[PDB]
């Protein structure tokens, strides 16, 4: 948590200039970094990383990863997991058909907002499921039954440099990336999109009049969590402008889509104000894929009821 | 048939106003972009600036804002434009097209893509020399034919500076044709010769005659090549 | 300037000087001393209308391999001055074309000088001048040591010459220039240009007393 | 991991001088030691200790022995 003498790099991402310590204490460290601009905030100008007034900062180690990988959680004995293999299952009640397992099947834990990606898939008819429909504060949850193919890409050819703040603290940061300046994105085919969202559009109808309408709108406010897209994918944290997707109208009755996304490394998720996490730099163009299966949307609420 | 020239005065004083004429003919200048290009004798050919199809031109930075490229539309030129000039300028001047190309690697939509110009048609190229000396116009001297395939020429002398136009019969000759480059005396001035091979029969029938053109001096000779009299 | 030297009929590789940085474009170009210069390949390894398929480029396959132009089948026009224009996006703007690379053919086959005096002429003797012109066309290796010789002793003073320089027919071309009064012209019996190449002599001897 | 402005002891052995922290921060200590030659590096010469741009360095606390004891490793029953 040093003062950031950045400058616009050659506008996200900054090229700084600052003053750190090496493997001795009195011998200070005039070295430079690469972040992005929802890494530092200022105080030419000069910056200080976002959370060093607010949760302690703390990097990662390099060799632990964050892919997510299936857990099956288990009872022991005198304990059972029950099991309802109901299809068309609402979310609670009776289920007709209930089996005995002592574990669960594979379970990533996709730390995910919105999108919900990698998760499991319904059958027959996509099921609605919501703890209160009437109730707007309630999150409604979606789970699909045809996954779709999203790819998300950061096509920068970034390189990891190492300084020694030590002794035994070693850090790796950005250093001058190769390739190309290519923001973030990731891509959606408008057509089974299309086809997926007009499925939802009659599923939503079950919960509603038979001529109504379904209006779709991007993120209103909060924290960029809660507006944009955040998900894990090869290390780097990513956050899309999900504003291209929900902009539709929907009454009774082959390219693909691009959303700008951004990343950001020093993570506070949670919200926990007190520690906090870097993201360690991943070297060569990140290419993830995935496949979408939920999603957690909220009415607006207060309104002339089933005008719209 | 696109064809350009290149147009100078090929002597300018320093720190004056040098002007380069680029004439254009088998096309509009409305469909691609255009740009200067010299070479310095001791340096490699340097790139000088362009110019666009919506009449916005571009200087490289190096010229520390000397430069001035227009174009007419009536008269289809390209005009060059350098003041403040200094002998350093010397060089052999080139006007070829430029051509856009956009080399795309990854989405348009951010803008994912690089423009790169590529000169595809040139010019013939004109020497401009930039000096305080005055002009000194050529002597053109008909060698004339041995009596005993013969060989005759034309000799021209001392002048400045280069370059010389020499053809034979108003470019009605081009076979045989061989012109020897100037020489450079300790005068500072210019030499060269110019020989055609043609057969002896031809000698007392055709009307051979060379004709030297020197810009600079803005002088046309035409010399009438006649054996001797013995 | 970078030199190089291939021999006749070998497939030749100039390489590029600056290397690439991200997604590129190259383009190679030759260029002629006193001629316009003309680009050989255009992105990567697209090729113009009129350049032959001897010449090659490098393919853009993300990186990992360097651009180079691969000139097969060398002969004695491919003697020029190459340049590499890199356009890649971290550099951005490339107005420098790099680094000279000055290709030069060996093994040619040697051809005799064809050497031809010339007396200055009649209408220069009556401007109060006089001037010997020898000129040597058609010679290889380009190496020639011109002398002037007055009668049987040679002269050193007003002689002027110029360096060899090739023509179309991948063949060097030298001129000398003896700058003289027209006394002196018409006082010596004879007078002739000696010219020595790759051992060999060949003289050209010219007269005022014949035709 | 200070600047060690050593002299040669009066060769392995170095005597130090640098600068510290006391028990108050802005107060800094000015004190000497005394170390052996594979303890220190140079950067007079100036030295810093050898582990200062790898490992973290800790030292042990002084009570804690580090003479060998004699271990019986055991298994429960059923084996
Ligand atoms: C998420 O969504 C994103 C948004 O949709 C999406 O982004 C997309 O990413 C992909 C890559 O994944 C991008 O694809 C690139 O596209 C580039 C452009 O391709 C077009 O243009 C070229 C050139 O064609 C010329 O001629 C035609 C007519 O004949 C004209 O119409 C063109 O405009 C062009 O004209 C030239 O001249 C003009 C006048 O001077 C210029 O103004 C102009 O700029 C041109 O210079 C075509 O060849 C392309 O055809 C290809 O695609 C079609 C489908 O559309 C195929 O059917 C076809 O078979 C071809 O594959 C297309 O029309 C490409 O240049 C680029 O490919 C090069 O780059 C990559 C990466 O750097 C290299 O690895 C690769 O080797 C390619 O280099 C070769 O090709 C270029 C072509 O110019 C050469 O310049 C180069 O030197 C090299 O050629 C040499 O090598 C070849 C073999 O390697 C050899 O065969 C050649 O003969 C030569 O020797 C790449 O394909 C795409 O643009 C993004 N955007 C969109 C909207 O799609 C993203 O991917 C998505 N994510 C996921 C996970 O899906
Ligand atoms: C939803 O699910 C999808 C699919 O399950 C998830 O997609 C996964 O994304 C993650 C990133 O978030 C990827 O992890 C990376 O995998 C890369 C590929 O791993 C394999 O290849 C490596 C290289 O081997 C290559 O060459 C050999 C020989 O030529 C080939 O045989 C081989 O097929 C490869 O082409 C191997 O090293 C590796 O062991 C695998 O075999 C890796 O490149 C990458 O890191 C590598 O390098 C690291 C640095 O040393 C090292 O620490 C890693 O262990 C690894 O070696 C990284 O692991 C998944 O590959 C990708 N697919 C799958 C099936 O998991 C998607 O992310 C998910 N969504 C979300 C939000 O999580
Ligand atoms: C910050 O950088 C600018 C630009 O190089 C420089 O003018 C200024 O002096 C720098 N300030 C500090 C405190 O380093
Ligand atoms: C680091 O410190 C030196 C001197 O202590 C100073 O000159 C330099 O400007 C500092 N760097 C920054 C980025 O402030
Ligand atoms: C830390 O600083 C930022 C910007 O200066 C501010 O928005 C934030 O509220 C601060 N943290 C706390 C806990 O006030
Ligand atoms: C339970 O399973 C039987 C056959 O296995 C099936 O006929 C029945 O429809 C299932 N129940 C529900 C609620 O789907
Ligand atoms: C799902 O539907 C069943 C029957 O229609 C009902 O008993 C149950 O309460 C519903 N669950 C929710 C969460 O609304
Ligand atoms: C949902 O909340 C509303 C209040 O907004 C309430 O009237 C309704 O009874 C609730 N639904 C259930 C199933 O409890
Ligand atoms: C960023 O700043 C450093 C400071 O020394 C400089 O060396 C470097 O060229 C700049 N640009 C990049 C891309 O690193
Ligand atoms: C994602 O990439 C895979 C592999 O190239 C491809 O099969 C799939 O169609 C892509 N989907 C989208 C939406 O780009
Ligand atoms: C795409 O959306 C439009 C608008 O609702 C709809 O009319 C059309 O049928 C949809 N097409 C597909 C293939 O989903
Ligand atoms: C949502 O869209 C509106 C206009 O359609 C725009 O003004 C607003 O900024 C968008 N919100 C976000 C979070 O992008
Ligand atoms: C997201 O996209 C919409 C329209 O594409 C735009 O209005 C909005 O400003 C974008 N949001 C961000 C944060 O870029
Ligand atoms: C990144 O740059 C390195 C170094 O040039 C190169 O070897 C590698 O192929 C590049 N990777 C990508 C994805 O551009
Ligand atoms: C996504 O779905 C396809 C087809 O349904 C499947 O082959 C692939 O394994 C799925 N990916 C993941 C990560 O489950
Ligand atoms: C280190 O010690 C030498 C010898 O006493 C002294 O001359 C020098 O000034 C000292 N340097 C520092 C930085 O203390
Ligand atoms: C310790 O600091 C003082 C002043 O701050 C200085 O005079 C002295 O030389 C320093 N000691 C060493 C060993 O550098
Ligand atoms: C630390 O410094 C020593 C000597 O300067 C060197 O031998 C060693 O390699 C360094 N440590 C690392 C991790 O490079």
Not at chain 1, 40 to 47: E, K, L
Not at chain 2, 164 to 188: D, K, M, R
Not at chain 3, 161 to 177: I, R
Request: with cysteine; net charge positive; charged share 15%.
């Amino acid at each position: 948590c040093v003062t950031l003498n950045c400058s616009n790099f050659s506008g996200e991402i900054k090229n700084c200039s600052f003053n750190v310590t090496t493997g001795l204490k009195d011998k200070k460290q005039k070295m430079d970094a690469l972040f992005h601009r929802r890494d530092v905030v200022q105080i030419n100008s000069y910056y200080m990383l976002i959370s060093c007034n607010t949760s302690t900062m703390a990097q990662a180690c390099p060799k632990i990863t964050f892919e997510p990988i299936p857990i099956h959680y288990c009872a022991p004995a005198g304990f059972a997991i029950l099991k309802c293999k109901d299809k068309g299952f609402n979310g609670t009640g009776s289920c007709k058909n209930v089996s005995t397992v002592q574990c669960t099947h594979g379970i990533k834990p996709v730390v995910t907002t919105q999108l919900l990606l990698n998760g499991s898939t319904a059958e027959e008819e996509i099921v609605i499921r919501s703890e209160n429909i009437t109730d707007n504060a309630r999150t409604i949850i979606v789970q699909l039954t045809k996954p779709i193919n999203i790819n998300c890409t950061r096509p920068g050819n970034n390189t990891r440099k190492s300084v020694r703040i030590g002794p035994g603290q070693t850090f790796y940061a950005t250093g001058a990336i190769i390739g190309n300046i290519r923001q973030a994105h990731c891509n959606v085919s408008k057509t089974e999109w299309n086809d997926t969202l007009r499925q939802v559009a009659e599923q939503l109808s079950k919960h509603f009049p038979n001529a109504t309408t379904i209006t779709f709108a991007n993120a209103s406010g909060g924290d960029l969590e809660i507006t944009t897209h955040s998900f894990n994918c090869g290390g780097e944290f990513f956050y899309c402008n999900t504003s291209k997707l929900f902009s539709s109208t929907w009454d009774n009755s082959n390219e693909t889509i691009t959303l700008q996304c951004k990343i950001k490394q020093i993570i506070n998720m949670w919200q926990q104000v007190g520690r906090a996490m870097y993201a360690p730099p991943i070297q060569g163009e990140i290419r993830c894929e995935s496949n979408i299966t939920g999603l957690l949307l909220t009415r607006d609420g207060g309104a002339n009821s089933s005008t719209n | 048939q696109v064809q350009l020239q290149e147009s100078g005065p090929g002597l300018v004083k320093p720190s004056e106003t040098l002007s380069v004429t680029c004439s254009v003919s088998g096309d509009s200048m409305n469909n691609y972009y255009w740009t200067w290009i010299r070479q310095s004798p001791g340096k490699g050919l340097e790139w000088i600036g362009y110019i666009s199809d919506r009449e916005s031109a571009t200087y490289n930075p190096s010229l520390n804002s000397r430069v001035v490229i227009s174009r007419d539309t009536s008269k289809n030129q390209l005009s060059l434009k350098l003041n403040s000039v200094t002998p350093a300028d010397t060089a052999v001047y080139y006007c070829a097209t430029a051509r856009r190309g956009q080399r795309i690697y990854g989405v348009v939509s951010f803008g994912e893509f690089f423009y790169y110009y590529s000169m595809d048609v040139w010019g013939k190229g004109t020497t401009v020399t930039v000096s305080s000396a005055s002009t000194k116009g050529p002597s053109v001297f008909p060698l004339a034919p041995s009596s005993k395939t013969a060989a005759l020429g034309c000799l021209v002398k001392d002048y400045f500076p280069e370059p010389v136009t020499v053809s034979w019969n108003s470019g009605a000759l081009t076979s045989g044709v061989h012109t020897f480059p100037a020489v450079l005396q300790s005068s500072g001035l210019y030499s060269l010769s110019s020989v055609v091979t043609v057969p002896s029969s031809s000698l007392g029938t055709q009307t051979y005659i060379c004709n030297v053109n020197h810009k600079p001096s803005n002088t046309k000779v035409d010399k009438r090549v006649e054996p001797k009299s013995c | 300037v970078r030199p190089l030297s291939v021999a006749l009929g070998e497939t030749a590789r100039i390489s590029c000087g600056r290397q690439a940085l991200g997604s590129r474009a190259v383009q190679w170009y030759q260029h002629r001393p006193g001629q316009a210069p003309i680009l050989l390949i255009y992105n990567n390894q697209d090729r113009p209308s009129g350049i032959p398929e001897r010449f090659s480029g490098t393919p853009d396959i993300n990186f990992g391999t360097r651009a180079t132009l691969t000139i097969s089948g060398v002969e004695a026009g491919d003697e020029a001055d190459y340049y590499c224009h890199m356009w890649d996006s971290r550099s951005g703007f490339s107005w420098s074309f790099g680094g000279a690379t000055r290709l030069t053919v060996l093994g040619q086959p040697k051809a005799a000088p064809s050497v031809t005096l010339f007396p200055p002429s009649s209408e220069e003797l009556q401007a109060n001048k006089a001037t010997l012109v020898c000129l040597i066309s058609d010679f290889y290796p380009g190496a020639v040591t011109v002398a002037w010789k007055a009668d049987s002793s040679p002269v050193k003073a007003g002689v002027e010459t110029t360096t060899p320089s090739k023509q179309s027919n991948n063949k060097y071309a030298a001129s000398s220039y003896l700058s003289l009064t027209p006394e002196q012209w018409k006082s010596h019996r004879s007078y002739s240009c000696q010219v020595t190449h790759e051992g060999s002599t060949v003289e050209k001897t010219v007269a005022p007393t014949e035709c």
